[PDB]
């Protein structure tokens with residue numbers, strides 16, 4: 001069940017990330033109205049709702065595709081927001097959590 005092993009593992013990892021107390025800024029797409037100039041600077045927006053959909057839609061056929069999207073959630077945030085903002089802080093906390101979980105799961109060697 002090599003496809004469903006991957007799916008299972010990713011779903012677990014994604015749920016844990018979504019349940020984390022620092023995930024709240026990333027739960028839905030950034031709104032243009034709340035972020036002036038966001039979509040002019042961030043070319044590939046990503047969020048955890050979209051990732052959930054992608055997962056359900058069987059898009060994440062490799063660990064690399066999953067990693068790229070979730071990494072993008074953090075890097076987008078860090079480019080856009082000031083370094084001591086609450087959003088920037090949440091990104092790094094959640095990113096630390098993400099790297100531990102992917103290492104825990106044996107997704108990167």
Ligand SMILES: COc1cccc2onc(N)c12
Nearest residue numbers: 025026030034035077080087
């Ligand atoms: C509440 O989410 C936001 C609102 C406005 C700007 C944002 O940048 N990164 C975010 N996660 C974000």
